[PDB]
Amino acid sequence: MRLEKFIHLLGERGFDGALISPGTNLYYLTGLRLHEVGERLAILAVSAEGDYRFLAPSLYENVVNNFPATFWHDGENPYAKLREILEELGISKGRILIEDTMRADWLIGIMKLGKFTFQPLSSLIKELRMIKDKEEVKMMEHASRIADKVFEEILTWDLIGMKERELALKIELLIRELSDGIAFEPIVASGENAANPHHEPGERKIRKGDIIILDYGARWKGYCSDITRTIGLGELDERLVKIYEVVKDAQESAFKAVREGIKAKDVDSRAREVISKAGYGEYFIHRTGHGLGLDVHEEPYIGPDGEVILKNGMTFTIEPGIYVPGLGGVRIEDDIVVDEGKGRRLTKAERELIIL
Template sequence: MDRIRKLQNMMKDRGIDYVIIGPTSNMFYLTNFSEEQMERPLFFVVSEGHSYFLAPKLYEEQLSKYNFEIISYADGEDPYSKMDLNTNSIIAIDDQLWSVFTINLIRKFNPSNLIPASTLLKELRMRKDKEEINIMEEGLKIAENSFLQFLNNIKEGSSECKLADRLEEIFKENGADGVSFKTILTSGPNTSMPHLRCTDRKVRRGDVIIVDFGIKYRGYCTDTTRVVSLGNPSDEVKKIHEIVLNAQESAEKAKNGMKGKEIDSIARGIIAKAGYSQFFIHRTGHGIGIDVHEDPYISQDSEQIIEQNMTFTIEPGIYLPGKFGIRIEDMVVMGEKEARPLNKLEKEIYVI
């Protein structure tokens, strides 16, 4: 309730009439209720003096324990006509709400302006409280122990996807509620594609293996990347790993009050100095919390000032197309003076 009051205060300050939240991380943040998006509108609507769920009738009983007003509609009824929005208003729309709902809201209420709700909500969500940080640290313990346990499963001839599945099973066995994203486990030349998930490729002796993994635990996400080598890594792999590690550890020491782009430039500068700037093809990191990617972003264009209790990743990488890629990723929290890693897992190449 405190979070909703804070949101209402921000709305008042900025002249925003309504905030429309879908069944996303924002709904969980504001109401503690969590659901996937579907074709039936399920909104949490906030205005100055009012907040309520607009929900399909079949959610009525389930929502009743959340202690918010519920306005429900039956299948076949028009949900939008049950909403009390004035036309020509300023509406903040949940960034992840499906566009079909926004199009319908535009048609029905003809707003004078639409803005992404993240402009309000990110300011609340970026700064984590103690409990949120604790939950993420607990989640990381499960994720890291699972990774270590998983290493014994990596055998020549196993396919990337089979290995990724096995790691996800171990997460579950160790108490994870699920994954925060589909595990990335790539090998050999596939590692130069940073967002490829996995393929049928069988891992071979001499392969670099990149494991980028995260779990969901009590509503919060983890995100970590480590490098594995099946057999001794080549000199080139060792050299690139050292550059990336240096970039990662330097950026991880970011100071309170730096801008996102300043932290990015620490990592980017080290990689550029080593002569690989064109092979670092993504930003240095992203905020993490209920969403695996959220504000603040640690990117070349981020003017966001990184303050105490913001949690984010530091994950530089170098990708040599057709050869291999190396990325190392920790989660960090900004402290009073400087950031500290939430991960404990060591960052050397795991040689198997």
């Protein structure tokens, strides 16, 4: 049904076709999934008329099921074969949508097969992927359920002495155990390192007294979860305990505001104001949230620049944070789904400050 909706939407927006290399969008529209495609040209070509063909390396004739295809064997010019395909479908010229993540070398090669006008596929597909259907929500529900479970397990561990990279690897192995895989490289940021929202787990040793930001996500049948919890080891510096309660308040506040009809930026503003009123406005160095589904980061964005009007089915995160250089940081993130016109938490893990 999706591929057909996409096709109708293609015409409604004036595009003649689309070229979609493997990845989340391809999967979304067809269920097709190729293992490590790398350099080998693999492309779903779609016409606004209704026809479509998937060009792929002979090596994938098994995974493609019976999806209309045309294979190319090594020694052949994938680009020439694509050109023929573009002709049969009648799109060897015109405005063509291009998968956002496709390799530049493939696009360069595609540029020689005809005279086209290009635009990123996301500019149009986001309209469909932003509103999750019932099954997609169920899948995200389980991914979030697993993220909750992983958190519970982490708390039974003895963190002291562990190095960030080490804790992150344990989290990662657990996620790979409980799910289809990590949604992204887990992030463990301890002590003063928690002050960097984009910290990359390293050699720092976790010690008593350290605040720790735990950020990770699982994947279930392709759908992602993305959670973040901040815990403390022993007694935390008093300045960080105060900060925590503030972020907690901001996150719950932003969540309650979630309603069908409000702009994404208003949700961000609702968490933003709580943090400003407490005097930490300058330390909240990022958007309040981002959407998720087949990817960790997708529409709609929950920042001061989010223009999307929330609607039932949309899924995104709420994770305001406060980062103080030389001291640390705190972030509390939940995956939220707009349901029955109201915000509903997909992740249930403990929100109160936990001191191991």
